[PDB]
Structures are given as structure tokens and as C-alpha cells.
mmCIF file of C-alpha atoms in Angstrom:
data_model
loop_
_atom_site.group_PDB
_atom_site.id
_atom_site.type_symbol
_atom_site.label_atom_id
_atom_site.label_comp_id
_atom_site.label_asym_id
_atom_site.label_seq_id
_atom_site.Cartn_x
_atom_site.Cartn_y
_atom_site.Cartn_z
ATOM 1 C CA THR A 1 36.472 -17.063 -27.341
ATOM 2 C CA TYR A 2 33.543 -18.490 -25.743
ATOM 3 C CA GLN A 3 33.364 -21.043 -23.054
ATOM 4 C CA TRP A 4 31.502 -24.492 -22.723
ATOM 5 C CA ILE A 5 28.855 -23.778 -20.235
ATOM 6 C CA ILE A 6 27.402 -27.341 -20.110
ATOM 7 C CA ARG A 7 26.649 -28.110 -16.495
ATOM 8 C CA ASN A 8 23.270 -27.180 -15.302
ATOM 9 C CA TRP A 9 22.176 -26.150 -11.768
ATOM 10 C CA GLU A 10 20.864 -29.706 -11.236
ATOM 11 C CA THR A 11 24.024 -31.550 -12.001
ATOM 12 C CA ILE B 1 10.831 -7.282 -9.440
ATOM 13 C CA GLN B 2 10.543 -4.688 -12.235
ATOM 14 C CA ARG B 3 12.534 -1.878 -12.984
ATOM 15 C CA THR B 4 11.256 1.362 -14.930
ATOM 16 C CA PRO B 5 13.373 2.236 -18.183
ATOM 17 C CA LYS B 6 15.784 5.323 -18.736
ATOM 18 C CA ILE B 7 14.921 7.454 -21.805
ATOM 19 C CA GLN B 8 17.397 9.565 -24.178
ATOM 20 C CA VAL B 9 16.864 10.528 -26.879
ATOM 21 C CA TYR B 10 19.553 12.609 -28.640
ATOM 22 C CA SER B 11 21.572 12.549 -32.347
ATOM 23 C CA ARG B 12 24.790 10.911 -32.943
ATOM 24 C CA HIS B 13 26.570 14.076 -34.473
ATOM 25 C CA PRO B 14 26.264 17.740 -32.997
ATOM 26 C CA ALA B 15 22.462 18.576 -34.869
ATOM 27 C CA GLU B 16 22.568 20.902 -37.542
ATOM 28 C CA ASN B 17 19.194 21.946 -39.939
ATOM 29 C CA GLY B 18 18.965 20.376 -43.320
ATOM 30 C CA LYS B 19 22.312 18.586 -42.914
ATOM 31 C CA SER B 20 22.676 14.364 -42.529
ATOM 32 C CA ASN B 21 22.629 12.821 -39.047
ATOM 33 C CA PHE B 22 21.255 9.798 -36.643
ATOM 34 C CA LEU B 23 18.534 10.049 -34.541
ATOM 35 C CA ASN B 24 18.912 7.386 -31.430
ATOM 36 C CA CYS B 25 16.740 6.563 -28.031
ATOM 37 C CA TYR B 26 18.847 4.746 -25.332
ATOM 38 C CA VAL B 27 17.075 2.588 -22.974
ATOM 39 C CA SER B 28 18.398 1.265 -20.176
ATOM 40 C CA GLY B 29 18.392 0.197 -16.600
ATOM 41 C CA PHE B 30 15.242 -1.794 -17.264
ATOM 42 C CA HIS B 31 13.825 -5.221 -16.196
ATOM 43 C CA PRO B 32 12.177 -7.616 -17.794
ATOM 44 C CA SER B 33 13.830 -7.244 -21.424
ATOM 45 C CA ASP B 34 10.883 -6.785 -23.240
ATOM 46 C CA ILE B 35 10.704 -3.404 -24.580
ATOM 47 C CA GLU B 36 8.506 -1.759 -27.390
ATOM 48 C CA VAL B 37 11.119 1.646 -28.775
ATOM 49 C CA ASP B 38 9.364 3.703 -31.512
ATOM 50 C CA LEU B 39 11.007 7.076 -33.052
ATOM 51 C CA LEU B 40 8.874 9.939 -33.775
ATOM 52 C CA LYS B 41 8.784 12.173 -36.974
ATOM 53 C CA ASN B 42 5.602 14.666 -36.088
ATOM 54 C CA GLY B 43 3.721 12.013 -34.014
ATOM 55 C CA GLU B 44 4.201 9.193 -36.521
ATOM 56 C CA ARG B 45 6.167 6.607 -35.936
ATOM 57 C CA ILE B 46 9.138 6.264 -38.600
ATOM 58 C CA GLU B 47 8.469 2.413 -39.781
ATOM 59 C CA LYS B 48 12.473 2.002 -41.044
ATOM 60 C CA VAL B 49 14.355 1.881 -37.193
ATOM 61 C CA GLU B 50 17.171 -0.761 -36.433
ATOM 62 C CA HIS B 51 18.225 -1.675 -32.680
ATOM 63 C CA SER B 52 21.346 -3.189 -30.911
ATOM 64 C CA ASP B 53 21.628 -6.261 -30.100
ATOM 65 C CA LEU B 54 20.331 -7.077 -26.546
ATOM 66 C CA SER B 55 23.295 -6.586 -24.166
ATOM 67 C CA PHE B 56 23.576 -5.476 -20.556
ATOM 68 C CA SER B 57 25.667 -4.022 -17.845
ATOM 69 C CA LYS B 58 27.775 -5.789 -14.636
ATOM 70 C CA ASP B 59 24.552 -4.765 -12.738
ATOM 71 C CA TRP B 60 22.297 -7.189 -14.722
ATOM 72 C CA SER B 61 20.891 -3.409 -15.998
ATOM 73 C CA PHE B 62 19.294 -4.292 -19.886
ATOM 74 C CA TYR B 63 20.324 -1.813 -22.323
ATOM 75 C CA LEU B 64 19.582 -1.098 -25.981
ATOM 76 C CA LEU B 65 19.810 1.586 -28.770
ATOM 77 C CA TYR B 66 17.044 2.198 -31.355
ATOM 78 C CA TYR B 67 18.425 4.367 -34.253
ATOM 79 C CA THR B 68 17.289 5.965 -37.461
ATOM 80 C CA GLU B 69 19.609 7.952 -40.779
ATOM 81 C CA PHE B 70 17.749 11.396 -40.955
ATOM 82 C CA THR B 71 17.934 14.868 -42.105
ATOM 83 C CA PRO B 72 17.052 17.584 -39.300
ATOM 84 C CA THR B 73 14.931 20.589 -39.789
ATOM 85 C CA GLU B 74 13.225 23.533 -37.898
ATOM 86 C CA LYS B 75 9.709 22.627 -39.195
ATOM 87 C CA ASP B 76 9.741 18.874 -37.920
ATOM 88 C CA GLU B 77 9.503 17.781 -34.425
ATOM 89 C CA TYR B 78 11.118 14.459 -33.240
ATOM 90 C CA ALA B 79 10.659 12.368 -30.206
ATOM 91 C CA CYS B 80 10.824 9.070 -28.405
ATOM 92 C CA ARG B 81 7.788 6.861 -28.139
ATOM 93 C CA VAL B 82 8.462 4.049 -25.140
ATOM 94 C CA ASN B 83 6.435 1.128 -22.936
ATOM 95 C CA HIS B 84 7.317 -1.345 -20.953
ATOM 96 C CA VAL B 85 5.532 -2.832 -18.046
ATOM 97 C CA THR B 86 6.656 -0.791 -15.701
ATOM 98 C CA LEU B 87 4.613 2.041 -17.818
ATOM 99 C CA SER B 88 0.344 2.020 -17.608
ATOM 100 C CA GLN B 89 0.679 3.698 -20.989
ATOM 101 C CA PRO B 90 3.519 5.293 -23.247
ATOM 102 C CA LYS B 91 5.649 7.524 -22.207
ATOM 103 C CA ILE B 92 7.414 9.919 -24.853
ATOM 104 C CA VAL B 93 10.543 12.514 -24.637
ATOM 105 C CA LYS B 94 11.067 15.215 -26.998
ATOM 106 C CA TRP B 95 14.293 15.435 -28.805
ATOM 107 C CA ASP B 96 15.413 19.028 -27.262
ATOM 108 C CA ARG B 97 17.654 20.501 -30.012
ATOM 109 C CA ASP B 98 20.099 20.994 -27.118
ATOM 110 C CA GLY C 1 46.451 -0.290 -20.779
ATOM 111 C CA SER C 2 44.458 -2.939 -19.179
ATOM 112 C CA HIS C 3 42.047 -4.845 -21.126
ATOM 113 C CA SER C 4 38.890 -6.927 -20.455
ATOM 114 C CA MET C 5 36.646 -9.560 -22.450
ATOM 115 C CA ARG C 6 32.989 -9.829 -21.588
ATOM 116 C CA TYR C 7 30.328 -12.024 -22.784
ATOM 117 C CA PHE C 8 26.885 -11.171 -21.602
ATOM 118 C CA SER C 9 23.676 -13.577 -22.925
ATOM 119 C CA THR C 10 20.338 -13.451 -22.151
ATOM 120 C CA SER C 11 17.791 -16.465 -21.701
ATOM 121 C CA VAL C 12 14.234 -15.083 -22.093
ATOM 122 C CA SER C 13 11.093 -17.908 -22.026
ATOM 123 C CA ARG C 14 7.968 -17.436 -24.153
ATOM 124 C CA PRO C 15 5.690 -20.083 -22.600
ATOM 125 C CA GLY C 16 3.464 -21.455 -25.549
ATOM 126 C CA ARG C 17 5.462 -19.425 -27.872
ATOM 127 C CA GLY C 18 8.525 -22.035 -28.676
ATOM 128 C CA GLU C 19 11.675 -22.427 -27.248
ATOM 129 C CA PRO C 20 13.099 -18.912 -24.755
ATOM 130 C CA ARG C 21 15.170 -17.125 -26.748
ATOM 131 C CA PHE C 22 18.721 -16.508 -27.058
ATOM 132 C CA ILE C 23 20.701 -13.359 -27.606
ATOM 133 C CA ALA C 24 24.624 -13.795 -26.742
ATOM 134 C CA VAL C 25 27.128 -10.773 -27.496
ATOM 135 C CA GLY C 26 30.652 -10.485 -26.743
ATOM 136 C CA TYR C 27 32.722 -7.508 -26.108
ATOM 137 C CA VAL C 28 36.349 -6.590 -26.121
ATOM 138 C CA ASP C 29 36.595 -3.363 -23.552
ATOM 139 C CA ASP C 30 33.443 -1.346 -25.708
ATOM 140 C CA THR C 31 33.467 -3.196 -28.691
ATOM 141 C CA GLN C 32 30.389 -5.512 -29.534
ATOM 142 C CA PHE C 33 32.539 -7.953 -31.441
ATOM 143 C CA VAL C 34 30.297 -11.099 -32.001
ATOM 144 C CA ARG C 35 26.587 -11.789 -31.997
ATOM 145 C CA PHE C 36 24.329 -14.987 -31.573
ATOM 146 C CA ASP C 37 20.594 -14.857 -31.471
ATOM 147 C CA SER C 38 18.488 -17.838 -31.474
ATOM 148 C CA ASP C 39 15.785 -16.301 -33.678
ATOM 149 C CA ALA C 40 17.577 -14.971 -35.903
ATOM 150 C CA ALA C 41 17.931 -16.299 -39.989
ATOM 151 C CA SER C 42 22.018 -17.290 -39.354
ATOM 152 C CA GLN C 43 21.504 -19.777 -36.909
ATOM 153 C CA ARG C 44 25.768 -19.369 -36.014
ATOM 154 C CA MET C 45 28.267 -16.950 -34.263
ATOM 155 C CA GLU C 46 28.396 -13.644 -36.662
ATOM 156 C CA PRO C 47 30.915 -10.925 -36.706
ATOM 157 C CA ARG C 48 30.402 -6.996 -35.390
ATOM 158 C CA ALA C 49 33.632 -5.700 -35.650
ATOM 159 C CA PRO C 50 36.191 -5.768 -39.002
ATOM 160 C CA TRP C 51 39.085 -7.532 -37.026
ATOM 161 C CA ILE C 52 37.127 -10.776 -36.100
ATOM 162 C CA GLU C 53 36.465 -11.633 -39.884
ATOM 163 C CA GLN C 54 40.320 -12.442 -40.254
ATOM 164 C CA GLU C 55 39.351 -15.405 -38.502
ATOM 165 C CA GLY C 56 39.053 -18.808 -40.550
ATOM 166 C CA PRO C 57 35.649 -21.202 -41.079
ATOM 167 C CA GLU C 58 37.202 -22.963 -37.871
ATOM 168 C CA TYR C 59 37.200 -20.489 -35.432
ATOM 169 C CA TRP C 60 33.124 -20.005 -36.683
ATOM 170 C CA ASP C 61 32.445 -23.397 -36.481
ATOM 171 C CA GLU C 62 33.415 -24.064 -32.777
ATOM 172 C CA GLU C 63 32.401 -20.719 -31.679
ATOM 173 C CA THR C 64 28.827 -21.541 -32.646
ATOM 174 C CA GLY C 65 29.370 -24.941 -31.299
ATOM 175 C CA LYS C 66 29.672 -23.542 -27.780
ATOM 176 C CA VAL C 67 27.255 -21.021 -27.891
ATOM 177 C CA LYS C 68 24.587 -23.237 -28.982
ATOM 178 C CA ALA C 69 25.518 -25.562 -26.004
ATOM 179 C CA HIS C 70 25.270 -22.476 -23.665
ATOM 180 C CA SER C 71 21.652 -21.968 -24.976
ATOM 181 C CA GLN C 72 20.645 -25.556 -24.436
ATOM 182 C CA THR C 73 21.937 -25.180 -20.483
ATOM 183 C CA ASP C 74 20.319 -22.273 -19.835
ATOM 184 C CA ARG C 75 17.391 -23.717 -21.739
ATOM 185 C CA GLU C 76 18.013 -26.593 -18.949
ATOM 186 C CA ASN C 77 18.444 -23.865 -16.321
ATOM 187 C CA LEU C 78 14.858 -22.161 -16.545
ATOM 188 C CA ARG C 79 12.887 -25.212 -16.340
ATOM 189 C CA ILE C 80 15.293 -25.807 -13.177
ATOM 190 C CA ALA C 81 14.744 -22.434 -11.776
ATOM 191 C CA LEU C 82 10.527 -22.886 -11.811
ATOM 192 C CA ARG C 83 11.224 -25.635 -9.690
ATOM 193 C CA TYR C 84 13.946 -24.226 -7.202
ATOM 194 C CA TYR C 85 11.586 -20.909 -6.800
ATOM 195 C CA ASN C 86 8.451 -23.099 -6.983
ATOM 196 C CA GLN C 87 6.797 -21.284 -10.085
ATOM 197 C CA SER C 88 4.304 -21.995 -12.877
ATOM 198 C CA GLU C 89 5.182 -22.570 -16.529
ATOM 199 C CA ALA C 90 2.747 -20.026 -17.648
ATOM 200 C CA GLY C 91 5.260 -17.086 -16.890
ATOM 201 C CA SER C 92 8.144 -15.606 -19.178
ATOM 202 C CA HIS C 93 10.945 -15.620 -16.811
ATOM 203 C CA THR C 94 14.901 -13.880 -17.912
ATOM 204 C CA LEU C 95 17.956 -15.459 -17.103
ATOM 205 C CA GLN C 96 21.365 -13.795 -17.599
ATOM 206 C CA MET C 97 24.741 -14.984 -17.903
ATOM 207 C CA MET C 98 28.119 -12.966 -17.983
ATOM 208 C CA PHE C 99 31.654 -14.263 -18.001
ATOM 209 C CA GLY C 100 35.241 -12.944 -19.159
ATOM 210 C CA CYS C 101 38.766 -11.746 -18.066
ATOM 211 C CA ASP C 102 40.206 -8.952 -17.012
ATOM 212 C CA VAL C 103 44.519 -8.533 -18.280
ATOM 213 C CA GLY C 104 46.942 -5.771 -17.475
ATOM 214 C CA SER C 105 49.126 -3.587 -19.869
ATOM 215 C CA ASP C 106 51.114 -6.872 -20.090
ATOM 216 C CA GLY C 107 48.216 -8.675 -21.387
ATOM 217 C CA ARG C 108 48.791 -11.452 -18.131
ATOM 218 C CA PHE C 109 45.721 -12.533 -16.088
ATOM 219 C CA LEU C 110 44.009 -9.782 -13.482
ATOM 220 C CA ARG C 111 40.453 -10.763 -13.144
ATOM 221 C CA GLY C 112 38.100 -13.525 -13.903
ATOM 222 C CA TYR C 113 33.982 -13.846 -14.064
ATOM 223 C CA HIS C 114 31.305 -16.156 -14.447
ATOM 224 C CA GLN C 115 27.826 -15.625 -12.667
ATOM 225 C CA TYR C 116 24.279 -16.015 -13.463
ATOM 226 C CA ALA C 117 21.260 -14.053 -12.420
ATOM 227 C CA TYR C 118 17.570 -15.175 -12.972
ATOM 228 C CA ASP C 119 14.866 -13.209 -13.500
ATOM 229 C CA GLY C 120 17.202 -9.820 -12.800
ATOM 230 C CA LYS C 121 18.401 -10.846 -9.095
ATOM 231 C CA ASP C 122 21.720 -12.562 -8.532
ATOM 232 C CA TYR C 123 21.528 -16.437 -8.435
ATOM 233 C CA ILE C 124 25.016 -17.709 -8.103
ATOM 234 C CA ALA C 125 29.018 -15.784 -8.758
ATOM 235 C CA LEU C 126 32.144 -16.985 -9.635
ATOM 236 C CA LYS C 127 34.273 -15.737 -6.471
ATOM 237 C CA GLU C 128 37.074 -13.703 -7.154
ATOM 238 C CA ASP C 129 39.872 -16.280 -6.162
ATOM 239 C CA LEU C 130 38.217 -18.824 -8.794
ATOM 240 C CA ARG C 131 37.287 -21.523 -6.605
ATOM 241 C CA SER C 132 34.328 -21.744 -4.396
ATOM 242 C CA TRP C 133 30.581 -19.740 -5.505
ATOM 243 C CA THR C 134 28.712 -16.905 -3.884
ATOM 244 C CA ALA C 135 24.878 -18.424 -3.448
ATOM 245 C CA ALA C 136 22.858 -15.396 -3.258
ATOM 246 C CA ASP C 137 19.253 -16.865 -1.696
ATOM 247 C CA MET C 138 18.227 -20.326 -0.849
ATOM 248 C CA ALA C 139 17.391 -21.736 -3.722
ATOM 249 C CA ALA C 140 21.098 -21.431 -5.452
ATOM 250 C CA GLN C 141 22.400 -23.101 -2.378
ATOM 251 C CA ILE C 142 21.623 -26.175 -3.784
ATOM 252 C CA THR C 143 23.066 -25.749 -7.158
ATOM 253 C CA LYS C 144 26.842 -24.094 -5.421
ATOM 254 C CA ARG C 145 26.821 -27.659 -2.969
ATOM 255 C CA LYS C 146 26.312 -30.036 -6.192
ATOM 256 C CA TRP C 147 29.081 -27.671 -7.616
ATOM 257 C CA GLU C 148 31.485 -27.585 -5.019
ATOM 258 C CA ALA C 149 31.192 -31.252 -4.391
ATOM 259 C CA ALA C 150 32.186 -31.937 -8.042
ATOM 260 C CA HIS C 151 34.863 -29.157 -8.217
ATOM 261 C CA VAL C 152 32.901 -27.417 -11.015
ATOM 262 C CA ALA C 153 35.544 -24.084 -10.741
ATOM 263 C CA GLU C 154 38.192 -26.001 -12.253
ATOM 264 C CA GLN C 155 36.731 -26.403 -15.892
ATOM 265 C CA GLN C 156 35.796 -22.459 -15.278
ATOM 266 C CA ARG C 157 39.218 -21.693 -13.771
ATOM 267 C CA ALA C 158 40.951 -23.298 -16.839
ATOM 268 C CA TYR C 159 38.959 -21.152 -19.147
ATOM 269 C CA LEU C 160 39.552 -17.824 -17.283
ATOM 270 C CA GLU C 161 43.345 -18.300 -16.327
ATOM 271 C CA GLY C 162 43.848 -19.962 -19.665
ATOM 272 C CA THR C 163 41.598 -19.790 -23.115
ATOM 273 C CA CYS C 164 40.269 -16.327 -22.241
ATOM 274 C CA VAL C 165 43.222 -14.695 -21.516
ATOM 275 C CA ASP C 166 44.828 -16.641 -24.008
ATOM 276 C CA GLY C 167 42.360 -15.446 -26.942
ATOM 277 C CA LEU C 168 41.469 -11.818 -25.839
ATOM 278 C CA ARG C 169 45.551 -11.086 -26.469
ATOM 279 C CA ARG C 170 45.022 -12.800 -29.420
ATOM 280 C CA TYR C 171 42.179 -10.161 -30.296
ATOM 281 C CA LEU C 172 44.098 -7.522 -29.271
ATOM 282 C CA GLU C 173 46.892 -7.929 -31.744
ATOM 283 C CA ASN C 174 44.670 -8.393 -34.692
ATOM 284 C CA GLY C 175 42.662 -5.302 -33.870
ATOM 285 C CA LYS C 176 45.775 -3.046 -32.998
ATOM 286 C CA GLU C 177 44.692 -0.118 -34.644
ATOM 287 C CA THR C 178 40.841 0.200 -33.520
ATOM 288 C CA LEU C 179 41.351 -1.512 -30.223
ATOM 289 C CA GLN C 180 44.518 0.129 -28.505
ATOM 290 C CA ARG C 181 43.026 3.556 -29.957
ATOM 291 C CA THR C 182 41.905 6.081 -27.187
ATOM 292 C CA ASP C 183 39.625 8.782 -28.857
ATOM 293 C CA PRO C 184 39.627 12.042 -26.648
ATOM 294 C CA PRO C 185 36.505 13.611 -25.823
ATOM 295 C CA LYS C 186 35.246 16.637 -28.266
ATOM 296 C CA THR C 187 34.555 19.521 -26.171
ATOM 297 C CA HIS C 188 31.407 21.898 -25.899
ATOM 298 C CA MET C 189 29.880 24.017 -24.115
ATOM 299 C CA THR C 190 25.822 25.371 -24.099
ATOM 300 C CA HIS C 191 24.303 28.487 -22.334
ATOM 301 C CA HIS C 192 20.134 28.712 -21.866
ATOM 302 C CA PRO C 193 18.034 30.795 -19.856
ATOM 303 C CA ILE C 194 15.799 29.097 -16.560
ATOM 304 C CA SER C 195 13.615 32.341 -15.833
ATOM 305 C CA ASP C 196 15.412 35.657 -17.075
ATOM 306 C CA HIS C 197 16.975 35.842 -12.698
ATOM 307 C CA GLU C 198 18.011 32.635 -13.363
ATOM 308 C CA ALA C 199 20.424 30.553 -16.243
ATOM 309 C CA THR C 200 21.416 27.176 -17.330
ATOM 310 C CA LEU C 201 24.924 25.738 -18.941
ATOM 311 C CA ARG C 202 25.848 22.679 -19.839
ATOM 312 C CA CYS C 203 29.201 21.160 -21.233
ATOM 313 C CA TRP C 204 29.256 18.379 -23.453
ATOM 314 C CA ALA C 205 32.156 15.454 -24.298
ATOM 315 C CA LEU C 206 30.939 13.706 -27.494
ATOM 316 C CA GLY C 207 33.337 11.822 -29.696
ATOM 317 C CA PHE C 208 35.074 9.337 -27.107
ATOM 318 C CA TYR C 209 36.286 6.076 -26.779
ATOM 319 C CA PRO C 210 36.588 4.229 -24.260
ATOM 320 C CA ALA C 211 33.123 5.070 -22.173
ATOM 321 C CA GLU C 212 35.321 6.213 -19.149
ATOM 322 C CA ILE C 213 34.516 9.914 -18.380
ATOM 323 C CA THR C 214 34.391 11.941 -15.774
ATOM 324 C CA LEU C 215 32.273 15.477 -16.123
ATOM 325 C CA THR C 216 32.747 17.245 -12.563
ATOM 326 C CA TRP C 217 32.078 20.864 -12.153
ATOM 327 C CA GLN C 218 33.810 23.475 -10.079
ATOM 328 C CA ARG C 219 32.161 26.585 -8.651
ATOM 329 C CA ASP C 220 34.140 29.939 -7.545
ATOM 330 C CA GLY C 221 37.581 27.331 -7.605
ATOM 331 C CA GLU C 222 35.700 25.188 -4.467
ATOM 332 C CA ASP C 223 35.066 21.239 -5.770
ATOM 333 C CA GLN C 224 31.809 21.840 -3.720
ATOM 334 C CA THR C 225 29.269 21.990 -6.634
ATOM 335 C CA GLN C 226 27.281 18.666 -6.259
ATOM 336 C CA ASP C 227 23.740 19.636 -7.200
ATOM 337 C CA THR C 228 24.862 19.123 -10.503
ATOM 338 C CA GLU C 229 22.377 17.123 -13.054
ATOM 339 C CA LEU C 230 24.226 14.599 -14.608
ATOM 340 C CA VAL C 231 23.555 11.996 -17.034
ATOM 341 C CA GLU C 232 24.616 8.604 -18.059
ATOM 342 C CA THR C 233 27.095 7.879 -20.776
ATOM 343 C CA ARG C 234 25.344 7.241 -24.023
ATOM 344 C CA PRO C 235 26.370 5.803 -27.384
ATOM 345 C CA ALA C 236 26.488 7.859 -30.400
ATOM 346 C CA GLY C 237 26.467 4.576 -32.795
ATOM 347 C CA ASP C 238 29.542 5.450 -34.597
ATOM 348 C CA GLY C 239 31.505 3.306 -31.921
ATOM 349 C CA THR C 240 31.848 6.465 -29.753
ATOM 350 C CA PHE C 241 30.180 7.859 -26.412
ATOM 351 C CA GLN C 242 28.675 11.188 -25.025
ATOM 352 C CA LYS C 243 27.836 12.478 -21.673
ATOM 353 C CA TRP C 244 26.916 16.019 -20.600
ATOM 354 C CA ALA C 245 26.639 17.743 -17.032
ATOM 355 C CA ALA C 246 23.864 20.645 -16.716
ATOM 356 C CA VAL C 247 24.804 23.036 -13.866
ATOM 357 C CA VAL C 248 22.075 25.876 -12.871
ATOM 358 C CA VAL C 249 23.893 29.620 -11.745
ATOM 359 C CA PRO C 250 22.951 32.547 -10.210
ATOM 360 C CA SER C 251 22.576 35.110 -13.586
ATOM 361 C CA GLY C 252 25.463 37.233 -13.765
ATOM 362 C CA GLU C 253 28.252 34.461 -11.639
ATOM 363 C CA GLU C 254 27.728 32.455 -15.602
ATOM 364 C CA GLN C 255 31.662 33.071 -15.549
ATOM 365 C CA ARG C 256 32.420 32.029 -12.012
ATOM 366 C CA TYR C 257 31.704 27.936 -12.649
ATOM 367 C CA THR C 258 34.179 26.259 -14.022
ATOM 368 C CA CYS C 259 33.709 22.193 -15.685
ATOM 369 C CA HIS C 260 36.938 20.005 -15.252
ATOM 370 C CA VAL C 261 36.878 17.084 -18.170
ATOM 371 C CA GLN C 262 38.542 13.388 -16.871
ATOM 372 C CA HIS C 263 39.568 11.169 -20.039
ATOM 373 C CA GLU C 264 42.426 9.322 -20.956
ATOM 374 C CA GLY C 265 42.794 10.970 -24.844
ATOM 375 C CA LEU C 266 43.521 13.615 -23.255
ATOM 376 C CA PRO C 267 46.955 14.220 -21.248
ATOM 377 C CA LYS C 268 45.579 16.660 -19.007
ATOM 378 C CA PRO C 269 42.477 17.300 -17.890
ATOM 379 C CA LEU C 270 40.175 20.187 -19.671
ATOM 380 C CA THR C 271 38.675 22.814 -17.764
ATOM 381 C CA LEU C 272 36.041 25.495 -19.316
#
């Protein structure tokens, strides 16, 4: 089950 | 930074003259990912070569396995032709029967 | 025994040749079970193991969704990385990501991973504790500080201690037959001459699963035989792995040198 990777390096 | 590929040419099953097998070329430890892997049947490229999905190990070390369905002989000479950025000119490793 | 889930994803920019290529792969121990490729026809999360097809359209709908989002965050992250490392648009860069969890025999949480490497070198990694970050260089420090302020590790903690373990357990049941298995190594031994007054002999392990193997040798019953030629564990292609270790011996002492094979498919190790 894949993870929600929704936050970038600058956020 | 760049890392030169580790090449390993071998068979899926224990090799035997006239009996069906799969010739493998396992390239690992390379960076960047962009690689050219050709499987050879008497210096001439095997056009029907399939490959593994781009994956890596915990140490970010890239690995791929290019493979082909074949029948080995005593007459034909098999090998792996590989070119990367770390390599000026294609580095070929002959398939040693053993 | 112990088990693990891992998702390995690579993003390579192609300046002027479109949008960076995104290839995401999932594993249960050493079994590629899922696939995602941006350049591929499908444009959906695809199966790579038979036991994952039993998941309904809902699974594949959601899984395709999450992975296309991760694809965008790393697209976003590659442009950001150029800013932080003071780099040009004209260059092609790699952004790799690895995340998963380890579980014991009881299928209970043991470890969690959430990490990035830009251009093959570490960038930021989630700490063993699952609360803080490891910012490798100066640039990642800017990411660590914003993520610590915003308490981002919590969004990751909930996945790794929760959904990751809950999901891996479910995979271990549905794929009991192939995943819980332990294929023992099919032992082999060859002998070839070096240059008449010298000779080489190698042993092989060939039909095993998992990739965990120890091809250590012994001279005259002594563990001391470190000048060995050992190769990297390589995949056969039929979901099994192989490894060999060749040792050079003085011609006439070929019988004097023993080889010890360590694997879990064998209750007691094999000596040759």
C-alpha cells in the first residue's frame, strides 16, 4: 500500500 | 558523482548444449541510471531482449537485469555489451560456460 | 520469520525531452509485486506478483492515485533541488526515494523508512525514532527545518506504524504459498586448472529464496581463508537467486579446502 508523498522540499 | 557498473553475464538454469535456457546480464552499482545493455550472439546484437524494472538497493545503488530466451551451443559464443557515462567505449564480458 | 515492505522510486529529469521519468516499484522481501512507469502505456499501478491481482478495482484506483501524486512531489522536488544546489535547467538529475516498514515473525512493527537521495548522494532521511530528520548536507537543512516546524514526520509515522504494517500483513496472508516459502540453495562444485602447478575450484548456490546467503570457505579446517574471489548475489529471473565463491589452491591440496554454505532453507549448514 503506497504512501501519500504530498509534501515537497520547500513546503 | 559517477559510479562504474558491475557486470555479470550468466544463465537462469545450469548451462547445457542444445537445451533451452535464459541468458542474463546483471548490471548493478551504477550512477546515473541511463545504461545501454546489449546481449550478444557472435558479436551480433540480440534484438529481442527484455529488461527488469528500474530499482535500487538501500545504498541507492542501481540494479537491472536484461534477459533472453535461448538454446545454448558449442558453436555459438555469447557475451554482454555495456556502455555507460563512466565508460569511454563499450566493455564486453564473454559468457564463461562456468 | 521477519518480513519487509519497500517502495523504490526514481525520478530522472529529461531537459527539453518532456517531464522527468517516474519509475516506482514495490517489494515484499525480494518479490517485486507492483510497478509504476510514467513513460508506460498503462498510466496505472500494475501487478507483478499473482497474489496482488485478487485486489479489487478500488485498490488499483487508489494505488494509481497515490503514486501519480508522489510523481508530482518529486517533479516539484527536482526543480527545487536545482535552486538549493545552484544548478542549471540543461542538466539531467536523479531523485530516488525509498520508504517501507519491517515487521517481526508476529507481523508487528519493527522499523520504518522514509528517505531521499539526490544525484545518488543522500539528501534527507527519516530517523530510526520516526520523529526527526537526518539532513546530510547544507541544502537539505532548509527542508529539515520547515518539516520539523510543520511536524511532517507525524504524517509519515501514521503510515509506517499503521497502513504500511496493516497492508504488509494482508500481503503475507494472501500470498502465503510463495511469500512464506524458503527455497534451499541447490549446491554445486566445479574445478579448473590455473597454470598446471596451480588450480581453481568454485562452489555454487543456485535455486534459493531469499537473497540472504553466506558462501564462506575454510582451509585445513581453519576459518582463515580470506583471499577468496566472491561475487554479488544475482537473480536467476525465475524469482530465485544465485551466488558463487572461487578459491585458488596449491595443486594437490584441492581436497584439503572445505566450503560452508549458510541459508535458512537448510536447518544445518552445508559443508563441501
